[PDB]
Design a protein around this ligand. Sequence first.
Ligand code: SF4
Ligand code: F3S
Length: 106
Amino acid sequence: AFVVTDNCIKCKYTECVEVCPVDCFYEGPNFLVIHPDECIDCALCEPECPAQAIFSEDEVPEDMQEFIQLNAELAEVWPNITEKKDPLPDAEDWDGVKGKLQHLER
Ligand code: SF4
Ligand code: F3S
């Protein structure tokens, strides 16, 4: 029951997927989501995200509550990703920029 939040958008390092025991990450053009029902809450992906975008559901910041629901719905429509990939080309420029939800691509 972990959740990918805002800082992932435009960064998408994919450092989180290799440690996932149940392969419950799904990828979008510029963001990743965790499938809530598949996730076993092992917490292993959280410290691996360079963007510090992953949070336990009950620890998702108040201002990013929308991502809980978002991960659930997008996990239904995006393809599963199980292998690390190169971060987006300008990940460092966007890492730390707030409100990147406005840049989310379906
Ligand atoms: S908490 Fe564990 S099972 Fe859930 S997405 Fe992260 S690595 Fe995968
Ligand atoms: S930037 Fe996104 S792709 Fe994974 S390593 Fe962090 S949640």
